[PDB]
Design a protein around this ligand. Structure first.
Ligand code: 7ML
Ligand code: CL
Ligand code: CL
Ligand code: CL
Ligand code: CL
Ligand code: NA
Ligand code: NA
Ligand code: NA
Ligand code: NA
Ligand code: NA
Ligand code: NA
Ligand code: NA
Ligand code: NA
Ligand code: NA
Ligand code: ZN
Length: 868
């Protein structure tokens, strides 16, 4: 009764195309009537039926060339229409109920507004259609609604007609000239404030920009508007791409399963990625709005003008658009901080997915529920694969490849292979072996051994690779790994790479299971920097000495290498101290490790942006990936103990740098953000100083803050260190902000990730909090999701209480909102990484969920893999 898996190798062109669709919506929250008039063309055999997808539709009528049709049947998920001519007009009338749509897939209610989400397969919840992304149709959309309740009626494209009717109704008709797959359809109806502006493209096209927000929120919209203009300008400058319509609409909605969605000319955003004011939004919020506005804008070419032939090609648009958003953020802001944080995500979150039961290549081969594959792998590893192409080609060749990709595939629904072929053909770089990155799951492990020969002045790297088997793939092969290096002499100067009288490129092509690279004219023993700028998404095994690593922290040319060396240095002592914790022994840390961080604090020449990240310890999820068996309690308690030890050893320096980076003016400007991130990195440690000093410092910052970045940093510190002021500050924040859900999400996260012994009792009680509701995905993610995913020490309490709590929540969400349920179940799918007693409790939890009445396909897919 659960759906069967679908396979990439079963792709077949559609038997029918639809070239044009004329939609009419007679809108109502309880009942919406949809009329869909489609112009269809048969491409397949004359006896093949038209198979339309549809979910939870009330069919009213079926006509073919205005003839009521008798040769049809409804089956599970489908309307099957037989005996059709080669070309015909299909007319479907059906009814749907937005108010009953709690899954937020299709047409649904967000507060008093009506809005849509159609990716991946939501349009079939609106009408019977060819809901597959290689069917590209020209849409015209006529929306009829009560004028008082729904004064703004929006769909893709341009307004081409409008009218008024009896009984207080009105209508607007929209025409989008670009053929599209239906996952890019959008409709919005509601009452909004509208921020209006203009962008003029470099060739002179004036684009009207319209940001729709709830009434009263115009003064929270200018940063998103500014970011949209910045995105448009950057895509012109960096990629040579201009917007292609004369109207760009963005609608902010409060109820949205995703971050945002690139519907053509009518993006729909979670309010979290639009609304910002300095008293309510942090620096991180500002830069996330920039990133997400950019991402959705960049999809206009990488996703919309060229779309996906089938959903197994998702990374064609998502890896490439993530790469574009990273490059945008990096160009405008701190490249090093962006790269560092994307590598933290890869190593600490995506690597874990790639070892888990849900492991998949960036181009999946097997899918049950496609909405389960909007993953760290498809997105973030997808972007690392694009970035490897960029590394192998260089910017100029890479842009030639982009240009050839659009020239060949503009206006079509293409494949990952098409994209690689365009890059290969434009650049003359052979990517045949490289293609295996699209087909193979799991994280490669690259092992490096080195040798310096003083007699010949040669340095030899012996490099091996392997990918462990994953649950989805028993066969693994070597990859084409771009392996960037730099060699340093004793004075920190770069040693030129050469062999036999010729320069050697610093990107080594590691293509074999084992190979040897020899460098000549190496006159002194080198300190290597390896896998520079995380040049391939791999685990590196090299036997660093502590002093090589502190040398790199002082001398490496690229800021990323200095941070990465610090990570390698910490990793050794995180592993040491988790083993000690398990034997009841306290933290042990050589003096020279603390001194390396002391030197970072006192180095006046280091970019504060970099110093702040070096002084930000790995998260508990990053730490977990260091271990064969995760002990989440040891990891959490070692992270705190490490923080305390550094706070004590560096107390004077931390306070000096905290004070030196004080800023009385607040500005959303990258140099100011960097100083603030350094100051607040110091605050985290100072919060673990002597209690009375810490309590005073933290509470003062909370009360004196003139911006939410500094207020939240102080509040977070009070929770993390369990300071005396904590309860008072948390109550003050609630009393001030309880009516603002986006702001309370920060507070729910702090509650959920608290180190307090009674955290689960508190989290359970917050299910009844005035600012919490199970009807809102953001609230769910901020309280329940943060508990299960970001507080593994409490989620994995040895009494099993965290698993039982999550089962309760998932029993609700399986029925209410399966997409949110499927995001929330992920911590349980990782059970084989834990000790036997925890595995037993997690299996029991998953078996309870497996037995639910009306188990969603979303959860079924993950439960089945986890219990295998
Ligand atoms: N096509 C959509 C699908 C929904 C989805 C799912 C998971 C993540 C994201 C997302 C990634 C980076 C920045 C902002 C959002 C998105 C947005 C999207 O545009 O990719
Ligand atoms: Cl109604
Ligand atoms: Cl809003
Ligand atoms: Cl930290
Ligand atoms: Cl316990
Ligand atoms: Na016709
Ligand atoms: Na930059
Ligand atoms: Na499905
Ligand atoms: Na579904
Ligand atoms: Na050696
Ligand atoms: Na060595
Ligand atoms: Na180079
Ligand atoms: Na090679
Ligand atoms: Na509530
Ligand atoms: Zn995207």
């Amino acid at each position: 009764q659960q759906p069967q898996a679908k396979y990439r190798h079963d792709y077949r062109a559609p038997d029918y195309q639809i070239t044009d669709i004329d939609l009419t919506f007679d809108l109502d929250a309880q009942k919406t009537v949809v009329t869909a008039v489609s112009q269809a063309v048969r491409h397949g055999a004359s006896d093949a039926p038209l198979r339309l997808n549809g979910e939870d539709l009330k069919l009213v009528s079926v006509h073919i060339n205005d003839e009521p049709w008798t040769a049809w049947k409804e089956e599970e998920g489908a309307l099957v229409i037989s005996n059709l001519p080669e070309r015909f007009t299909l007319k479907i009338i059906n009814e749907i109920s937005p108010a009953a749509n709690t899954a937020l897939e299709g047409l649904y209610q967000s507060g008093d507004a009506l809005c849509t989400q159609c990716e991946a397969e939501g349009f079939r919840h609106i009408t019977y259609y060819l809901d597959r992304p290689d069917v590209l149709a020209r849409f015209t959309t006529k929306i009829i609604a009560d004028k008082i309740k729904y004064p703004f009626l929006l769909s893709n494209g341009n307004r081409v007609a409008q009218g008024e009717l009896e009984n207080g109704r009105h209508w607007v008709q929209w025409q989008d000239p670009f053929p599209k797959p239906c996952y890019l359809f959008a409709l919005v109806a509601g009452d909004f404030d509208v921020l209006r502006d203009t962008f003029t493209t470099r060739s002179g096209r004036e684009v009207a920009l319209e940001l729709y927000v709830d009434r009263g929120n115009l003064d929270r919209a200018p940063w998103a508007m500014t970011s949209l203009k910045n995105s448009m300008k950057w895509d012109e400058e960096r990629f040579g791409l201009e917007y292609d319509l004369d109207i760009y609409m963005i609608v902010a909605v409060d109820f949205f399963n995703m971050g945002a969605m690139e519907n053509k000319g009518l993006n729909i955003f979670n309010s979290k990625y639009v609304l910002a004011r300095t008293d309510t939004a942090t620096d991180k919020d500002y830069l996330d709005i920039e990133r997400v506005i950019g991402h959705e804008y960049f999809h206009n070419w990488t996703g919309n003008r060229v779309t996906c032939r089938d959903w197994f090609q998702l990374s064609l648009k998502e890896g490439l658009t993530v790469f574009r958003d990273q490059e945008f953020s990096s160009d405008l802001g701190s490249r090093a901080v962006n790269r560092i944080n994307n590598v933290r995500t890869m190593r600490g979150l995506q690597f874990a997915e790639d070892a888990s039961p849900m492991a998949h290549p960036i181009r999946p081969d097997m899918v049950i529920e496609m909405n389960n594959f909007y993953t760290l792998t498809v997105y973030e590893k997808g972007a690392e694969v694009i970035r490897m192409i960029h590394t192998l080609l260089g910017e100029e060749n890479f842009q030639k490849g982009m240009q050839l990709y659009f020239e060949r595939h503009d206006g079509s629904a293409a494949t990952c292979d098409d994209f690689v072929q365009a890059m290969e053909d434009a650049s003359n770089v052979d990517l045949s072996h490289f293609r295996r990155w699209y087909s193979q799951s799991g994280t490669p492990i690259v092992t490096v051994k080195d040798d310096y020969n003083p007699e010949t002045e040669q340095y030899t790297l012996t490099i091996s690779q392997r990918t462990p088997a994953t649950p989805d793939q028993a066969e693994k092969q070597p990859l084409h790994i771009p392996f960037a290096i730099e060699l340093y002499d004793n004075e920190g100067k770069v040693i030129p790479l050469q062999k036999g009288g010729h320069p050697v490129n610093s990107v080594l092509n590691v293509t074999q299971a084992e190979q040897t690279f020899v460098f000549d004219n190496v006159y002194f023993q080198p300190v290597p920097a390896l896998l520079c700028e995380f040049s391939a998404p791999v685990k590196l095994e090299y036997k660093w000495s502590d002093q090589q690593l502190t040398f790199l922290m002082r001398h490496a040319r690229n800021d990323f290498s200095r941070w990465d060396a610090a990570q390698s240095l910490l990793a050794t002592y995180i592993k040491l101290n988790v083993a000690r914790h398990q034997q009841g022994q306290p933290l042990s840390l050589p003096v020279h490790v603390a001194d390396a961080f002391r030197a970072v604090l006192l180095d006046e020449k280091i970019d504060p942006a970099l110093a702040a990240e070096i002084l930000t310890l790995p998260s508990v999820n990053e730490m977990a990936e260091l271990f064969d068996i995760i002990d989440p309690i040891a990891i959490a308690e070692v992270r705190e103990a490490l923080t305390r030890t550094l706070a004590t050893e560096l107390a004077d320096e931390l306070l000096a740098i905290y004070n030196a980076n004080y800023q009385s003016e607040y500005r959303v400007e990258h140099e100011d953000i960097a100083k603030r991130t350094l100051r607040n990195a110091c605050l985290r440690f100072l919060a673990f100083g002597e209690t009375h000093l810490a309590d005073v410092l933290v509470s003062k910052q909370f009360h004196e803050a003139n911006n939410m970045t500094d207020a939240l940093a102080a509040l977070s510190a009070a929770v993390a260190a369990q300071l005396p002021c904590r309860d008072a500050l948390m109550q003050e924040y609630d009393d001030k902000w309880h009516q603002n859900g986006l702001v309370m999400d920060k507070w729910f996260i702090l509650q959920a990730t608290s180190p307090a012994a009674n955290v689960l009792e508190t989290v359970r009680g917050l299910l009844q909090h005035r600012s919490f509701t199970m009807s809102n995905p953001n609230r769910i993610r901020s309280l329940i999701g943060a508990f299960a995913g970001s507080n593994p020490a409490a989620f994995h309490a040895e009494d099993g209480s965290g698993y039982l709590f999550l089962v309760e929540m998932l029993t609700d969400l399986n029925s209410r909102n399966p997409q949110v349920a499927s995001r929330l179940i992920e911590p349980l799918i990782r059970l084989k990484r834990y000790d036997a007693k925890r595995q037993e409790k997690m299996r029991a939890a998953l078996e309870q969920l497996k037995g639910l009445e009306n188990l969603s396909g979303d959860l079924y897919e993950k439960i089945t893999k986890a219990l295998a």
